[PDB]
Amino acid sequence: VSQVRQNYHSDCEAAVNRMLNLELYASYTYSSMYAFFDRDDVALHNVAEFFKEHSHEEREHAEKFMKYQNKRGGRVVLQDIKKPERDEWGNTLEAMQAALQLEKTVNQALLDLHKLATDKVDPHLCEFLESEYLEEQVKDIKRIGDFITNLKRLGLPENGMGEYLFDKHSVKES
Amino acid sequence: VSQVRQNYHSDCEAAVNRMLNLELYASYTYSSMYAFFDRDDVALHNVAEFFKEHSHEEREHAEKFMKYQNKRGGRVVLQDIKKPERDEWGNTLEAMQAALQLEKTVNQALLDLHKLATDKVDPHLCEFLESEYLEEQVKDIKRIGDFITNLKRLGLPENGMGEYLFDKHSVKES
Amino acid sequence: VSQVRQNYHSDCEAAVNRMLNLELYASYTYSSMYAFFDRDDVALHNVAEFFKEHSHEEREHAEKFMKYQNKRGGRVVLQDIKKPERDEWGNTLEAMQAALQLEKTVNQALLDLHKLATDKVDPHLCEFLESEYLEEQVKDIKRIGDFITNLKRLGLPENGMGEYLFDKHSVKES
Amino acid sequence: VSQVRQNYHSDCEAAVNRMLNLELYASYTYSSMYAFFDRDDVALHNVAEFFKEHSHEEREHAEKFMKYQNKRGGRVVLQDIKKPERDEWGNTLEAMQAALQLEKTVNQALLDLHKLATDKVDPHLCEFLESEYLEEQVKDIKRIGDFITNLKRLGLPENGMGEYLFDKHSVKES
Numbered sequence: 001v002s003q004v005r006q007n008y009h010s011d012c013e014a015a016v017n018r019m020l021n022l023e024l025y026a027s028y029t030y031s032s033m034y035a036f037f038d039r040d041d042v043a044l045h046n047v048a049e050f051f052k053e054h055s056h057e058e059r060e061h062a063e064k065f066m067k068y069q070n071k072r073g074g075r076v077v078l079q080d081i082k083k084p085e086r087d088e089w090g091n092t093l094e095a096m097q098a099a100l101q102l103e104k105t106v107n108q109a110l111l112d113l114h115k116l117a118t119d120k121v122d123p124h125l126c127e128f129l130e131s132e133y134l135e136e137q138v139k140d141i142k143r144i145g146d147f148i149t150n151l152k153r154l155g156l157p158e159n160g161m162g163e164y165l166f167d168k169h170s171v172k173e174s
Numbered sequence: 175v176s177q178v179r180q181n182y183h184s185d186c187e188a189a190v191n192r193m194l195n196l197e198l199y200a201s202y203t204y205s206s207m208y209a210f211f212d213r214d215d216v217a218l219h220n221v222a223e224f225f226k227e228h229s230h231e232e233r234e235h236a237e238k239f240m241k242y243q244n245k246r247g248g249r250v251v252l253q254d255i256k257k258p259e260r261d262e263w264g265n266t267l268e269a270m271q272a273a274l275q276l277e278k279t280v281n282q283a284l285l286d287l288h289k290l291a292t293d294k295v296d297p298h299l300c301e302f303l304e305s306e307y308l309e310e311q312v313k314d315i316k317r318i319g320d321f322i323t324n325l326k327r328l329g330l331p332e333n334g335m336g337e338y339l340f341d342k343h344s345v346k347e348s
Numbered sequence: 349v350s351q352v353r354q355n356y357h358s359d360c361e362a363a364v365n366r367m368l369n370l371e372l373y374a375s376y377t378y379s380s381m382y383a384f385f386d387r388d389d390v391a392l393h394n395v396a397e398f399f400k401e402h403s404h405e406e407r408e409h410a411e412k413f414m415k416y417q418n419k420r421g422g423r424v425v426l427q428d429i430k431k432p433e434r435d436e437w438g439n440t441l442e443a444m445q446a447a448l449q450l451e452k453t454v455n456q457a458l459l460d461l462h463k464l465a466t467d468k469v470d471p472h473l474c475e476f477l478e479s480e481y482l483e484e485q486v487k488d489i490k491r492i493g494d495f496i497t498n499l500k501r502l503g504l505p506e507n508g509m510g511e512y513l514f515d516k517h518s519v520k521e522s
Numbered sequence: 523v524s525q526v527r528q529n530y531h532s533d534c535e536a537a538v539n540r541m542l543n544l545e546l547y548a549s550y551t552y553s554s555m556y557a558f559f560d561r562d563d564v565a566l567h568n569v570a571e572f573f574k575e576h577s578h579e580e581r582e583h584a585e586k587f588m589k590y591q592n593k594r595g596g597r598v599v600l601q602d603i604k605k606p607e608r609d610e611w612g613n614t615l616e617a618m619q620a621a622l623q624l625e626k627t628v629n630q631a632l633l634d635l636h637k638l639a640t641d642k643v644d645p646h647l648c649e650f651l652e653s654e655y656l657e658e659q660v661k662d663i664k665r666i667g668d669f670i671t672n673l674k675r676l677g678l679p680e681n682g683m684g685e686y687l688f689d690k691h692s693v694k695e696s
C-alpha cells in the first residue's frame with residue numbers, strides 16, 4: 001500500500017471514487033440545464049447562469065474528492081460520466097424540481113458514505129464530509145425548495161409572466 | 175426549425191455536438207493526469223497543475239461549443255463522457271506523449287469540421303474554428319512537443335533527477 | 349483603374365455598394381421603429397432607445413463599407429435610401445419580428461457577398477466579412493430571437509402588462 | 523472536581539496528558555533533526571529550517587492540549603520529555619523517513635484518543651480532534667510522503683547532487 005495510508009479502508013476508498021463520479025454526473029446535468037435555458041426558444045439567461053454556476057460548483061466538489069483520495073493514499077479510479085436523464089428540461093419549475101431531486105440524491109450518497117466511514121471508524125473521513133459537504137448540501141436543497149415554492153406561487157408552468165419575473169428577481173442578474 | 179437558424183446544416187449541427195463531447199473527453203483525460211501527478215508516489219506538483227489547467231481549458235472550449243450551437247439555432251445533444259484510456263500515466267514523458275496525441279486528435283477533429291463547414295458553405299462556422307480554435311491548438315501542440323524534446327534531453331524515463339528538474343523549471347511554479 | 353487596386357473584381361465592388369445601401373436601409377428602418385416607440389400613444393422608451401442604438405450601429409456598418417471600398421480602390425456609388433416598409437410597427441412583438449426578418453435579410457446579403465468573394469478568389473474581402481460582420485450578425489439575430497421568445501412568454505400582443513415589463517427588464521434602461 | 527467539569531471522563535483527561543507529552547516528544551525529535559542539518563559536515567540549511575518549523579508546530583500543538591485540559595477542568599500532569607531515538611539522522615532521506623514514522627505515530631495516538639472520546643460519549647473532545655488535529659496530520663503525512671518520493675527520484679542516499687537540489691527546490695528558502 002501507499003506509504004501515507006493509515007486507517008483508510010478499501011471500501012471507503014472505493015466509495016470515494018463513486019462519490020467523485022456522482023459529482024461529475026451532477027455537474028454534467030447542471031451543464032445541460034444551462035444549455036437548455038440558453039436556447040433561443042427558452043431564453044431565461046439568469047436561470048441559465050444559475051445552473052452554470054452550479055455545474056462549476058459540482059466539478060469543484062469532484063476535484064476535492066480527487067485531492068482527498070490522494071491525501072489518504074487511495075487511488076483515483078475514473079468511470080464514464082453518464083449523460084443527463086433528459087435532453088430538454090421543460091421550464092424553470094420542471095428544471096428546479098429535477099435539481100431538487102438531484103441534490104437529494106447527492107445528499108443521500110454523502111450520508112451513506114458517512115455511515116460507511118462510521119462503520120470503518122474513520123473520523124477523518126467523517127469530519128471531511130461533515131465540514132465540507134453536508135452543510136452546503138442542506139443549504140442548496142433549502143434554496144431550491146424556496147425557488148420551487150416561489151415558482152408555484154408565480155403560476156408555473158402556465159404563467160409565462162411569472163416565469164419571466166422569476167428570472168429577473170429570484171436569481172442573480174448575470 | 176429555430177427562428178434564428180440560417181445557413182446551418184444539420185450535419186454541421188451534429189458535428190458540433192460531437193466536437194463538444196470530444197472536448198469534454200479531453201478535459202477528463204487531463205483531469206486524470208492531474209490526479210496521477212498529485213499521487214504521493216508520483217508527487218510532481220507543477221506537472222499536475224499544468225494538466226489541471228489544461229483540463230479547465232478544454233472544459234471552457236466545450237462550453238464555447240454549447241454557446242455556439244445555441245447561437246446558430248442548433249440543439250445541444252449530450253452523450254456520455256468516456257473515461258480516459260489509462261488509469262495511470264507512467265511518468266512525465268509518457269503523459270506528455272499522450273497529451274501530444276490527444277491534442278493532435280482534437281486538432282484533426284477541428285480540421286475535419288472545417289472541411290465539413292467548407293463543403294456546406296458555412297463561413298461563420300469556418301471563421302469560428304479559424305479564429306477561436308485552430309491557432310490555439312497549434313500553439314498547444316508546439317508547447318507539448320517542446321516539452322517532450324526537453325524531457326528526452328533530461329534523460330527520461332530513467333533519469334529521475336531530470337524529471338525533478340523539469341517540474342521545477344519547465345512548467346509554471348504552482 | 350486606381351493605383352491601389354489589386355485582386356478586386358468589378359462584381360465585388362458593385363456588391364459592396366449594394367451592401368452599403370442595404371445597411372443604410374436597415375438603419376432607416378430602425379430609426380422608424382425608434383420614432384414609433386417614442387410616440388405619446390406608444391411610449392415604450394427603453395424599446396425606442398434599443399432601436400435608436402441599432403439604427404446607429406447600422407449606419408456605422410455602412411460607413412465601414414465606404415471605407416472598405418476606398419481602401420481597395422473601388423468607387424463608392426450611392427443610391428436612394430428607400431423608406432421603411434411600414435409607417436407604424438404595431439407593438440413590441442411585431443417590431444421585433446420585423447427586426448428579426450431584417451437582420452436575416454442583411455445576413456443573407458452578407459453570406460451572398462462572401463460567396464461572390466469566394467468565387468472571385470478575394471480572401472481579403474472574405475476575411476473582412478468573416479471578422480467584421482458575420483459574427484456580430486449572428487449575435488444580433490440570437491438576441492432578437494431571445495426577445496421574441498420572451499415577448500410571447502409575456503403574453504404579447506394582448507398582455508399590456510407584459511409589454512410594460514419587457515421595456516423595464518429586457519432592454520437597457522435609458 | 524473542578525467547578526467547570528462536565529462530561530469529561532478521567533480516562534480522557536489522562537489520555538490528553540499523554541498526548542501532550544507525545545507532542546513535546548515529537549517537537550524535540552524535530553529539534554534534533556534541525557541541529558543535525560545545521561552541522562558543518564551536513565549543511566543543508568533549508569532542510570534544517572523545515573525541521574525547525576515542524577518543531578515549533580508540535581510545541582504549539584502541545585500548548586493547545588494544555589489549554590484544552592484546563593478548559594475542560596482537567597489537570598495538566600507533565601512527565602519527562604524523552605530524548606530522540608537517534609543522535610544523528612544520516613541524510614535527508616533517512617530523516618524524512620523518520621519524520622513520516624513519527625507523524626504516523628502521532629496520528630495513531632490521535633485516532634486512539636478519538637476512539638476513547640467516542641467510547642466515553644464526549645463529542646466536544648471528538649470535534650476538537652477532528653477539527654484541530656486530524657486534517658493537519660493527514661496533510662503533513664502527505665507532504666512528507668511526497669518528499670520521500672522525490673528524494674528517491676533524486677537518487678538518495680547516493681546522489682549528493684540530488685540531495686543538494688532537494689534543499690534548494692523542495693523546501694522553502696530560509
Ligand SMILES: [Cl-]
Nearest residue numbers: 005006007008
Ligand atoms: Cl490503511
Ligand SMILES: [Cl-]
Nearest residue numbers: 008009010011
Ligand atoms: Cl482495507
Ligand SMILES: [Cl-]
Nearest residue numbers: 085086087088
Ligand atoms: Cl428529454
Ligand SMILES: [Cl-]
Nearest residue numbers: 130131652653
Ligand atoms: Cl469544523
Ligand SMILES: [Cl-]
Nearest residue numbers: 165168513516
Ligand atoms: Cl417587476
Ligand SMILES: [Cl-]
Nearest residue numbers: 168169516517
Ligand atoms: Cl426591479
Ligand SMILES: [Cl-]
Nearest residue numbers: 179180181182
Ligand atoms: Cl438553416
Ligand SMILES: [Cl-]
Nearest residue numbers: 182183184185
Ligand atoms: Cl440541413
Ligand SMILES: [Cl-]
Nearest residue numbers: 259260261262
Ligand atoms: Cl492503465
Ligand SMILES: [Cl-]
Nearest residue numbers: 339342687690
Ligand atoms: Cl537547478
Ligand SMILES: [Cl-]
Nearest residue numbers: 342343690691
Ligand atoms: Cl532556480
Ligand SMILES: [Cl-]
Nearest residue numbers: 353354355356
Ligand atoms: Cl484588380
Ligand SMILES: [Cl-]
Nearest residue numbers: 356357358359
Ligand atoms: Cl474586374
Ligand SMILES: [Cl-]
Nearest residue numbers: 433434435436
Ligand atoms: Cl404602415
Ligand SMILES: [Cl-]
Nearest residue numbers: 304305478479
Ligand atoms: Cl480574426
Ligand SMILES: [Cl-]
Nearest residue numbers: 527528529530
Ligand atoms: Cl465530568
